[PDB]
Amino acid sequence: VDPTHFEKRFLKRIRDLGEGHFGKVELCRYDPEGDNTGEQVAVKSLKPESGGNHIADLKKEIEILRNLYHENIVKYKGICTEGIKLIMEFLPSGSLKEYLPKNKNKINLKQQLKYAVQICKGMDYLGSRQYVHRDLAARNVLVESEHQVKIGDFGLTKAIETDKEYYTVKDDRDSPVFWYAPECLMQSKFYIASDVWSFGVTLHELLTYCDSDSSPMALFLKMIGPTHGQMTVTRLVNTLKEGKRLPCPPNCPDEVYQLMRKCWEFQPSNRTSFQNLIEGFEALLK
Numbered sequence: 001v002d003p004t005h006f007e008k009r010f011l012k013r014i015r016d017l018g019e020g021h022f023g024k025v026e027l028c029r030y031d032p033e034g035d036n037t038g039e040q041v042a043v044k045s046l047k048p049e050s051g052g053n054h055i056a057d058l059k060k061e062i063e064i065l066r067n068l069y070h071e072n073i074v075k076y077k078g079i080c081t082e083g084i085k086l087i088m089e090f091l092p093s094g095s096l097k098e099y100l101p102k103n104k105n106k107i108n109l110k111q112q113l114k115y116a117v118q119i120c121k122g123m124d125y126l127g128s129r130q131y132v133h134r135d136l137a138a139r140n141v142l143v144e145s146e147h148q149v150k151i152g153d154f155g156l157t158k159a160i161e162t163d164k165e166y167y168t169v170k171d172d173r174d175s176p177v178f179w180y181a182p183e184c185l186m187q188s189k190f191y192i193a194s195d196v197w198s199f200g201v202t203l204h205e206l207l208t209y210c211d212s213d214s215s216p217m218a219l220f221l222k223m224i225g226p227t228h229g230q231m232t233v234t235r236l237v238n239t240l241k242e243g244k245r246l247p248c249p250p251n252c253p254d255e256v257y258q259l260m261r262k263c264w265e266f267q268p269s270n271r272t273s274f275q276n277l278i279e280g281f282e283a284l285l286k
């Protein structure tokens, strides 16, 4: 009996957790005894639609996640073959975007810097395996407990070729542009330093407790104007070229803001690293 083999006839769909253009993540109960005692699991799968291989990309995502082992990376549990489904552990607290607005009273700056460290450890582990994540945002950081977070989605994750510094992207219409570094917006090139820029944005979200009126989209649309349609991304590039950045969050000390700003150097080569950030946060926690 293979414990990573989930039979479709026992995987009971409960509700949607997430939806993109091509696929979804759903809450299921795996219930082989038929009495609702089985474990809740998160299930990634494709919409019937498909195309230019969404299936090949999901199969690659499965092999990426199956072979990652880090306490700050969501746990692979198995697959279901029917078309294929990725089975992951279910974290009932959800993403930082769900959890932080409801728990501001109990999550103080120390706890925020601890989450920051754990996000940097999972990212540094992914970088060491020659992966770029390309979608690091608070909506993809899951809460295991009050004391532990995990990166919880790998839908855009790509291998950087051995002896290369970046991955060039082709399918980009659904890019999360308010988290993206200039090189990503201007040339669809994705470096590890591009994930460092996305981390700085995610840190700003963590420091604003993911409030919707302080989101990176809301704040950048206030700076550049919300009415620009197809011109939005070139206006965003121009704002960043001029050196404008997301402002210091309320109650964020300058010493934390300065680590964030090192994430947002225009040139990738000038940005801090994940291991520098961990050292910086650890000095502040000492």
Ligand SMILES: N#CCC1(n2cc(C(N)=O)c(NC(=O)C3CC3)n2)CCN(Cc2ccc(-c3ccccc3)c(O)c2)CC1
Binding pocket: 017, 018, 019, 020, 022, 023, 024, 025, 042, 044, 045, 046, 058, 074, 088, 089, 090, 091, 092, 093, 094, 095, 098, 139, 140, 141, 142, 151, 152, 153, 154, 155, 156
């Ligand atoms: N991380 C994280 C956030 C998500 N999440 C996982 C769990 C869990 N494991 O528990 C969870 N938990 C809760 O919300 C509990 C409070 C109730 N939320 C929810 C949002 N989706 C967005 C999304 C959807 C589809 C694709 C996708 C599909 C097919 C092919 C390619 C791409 C994709 O890459 C990403 C990502 C996972």
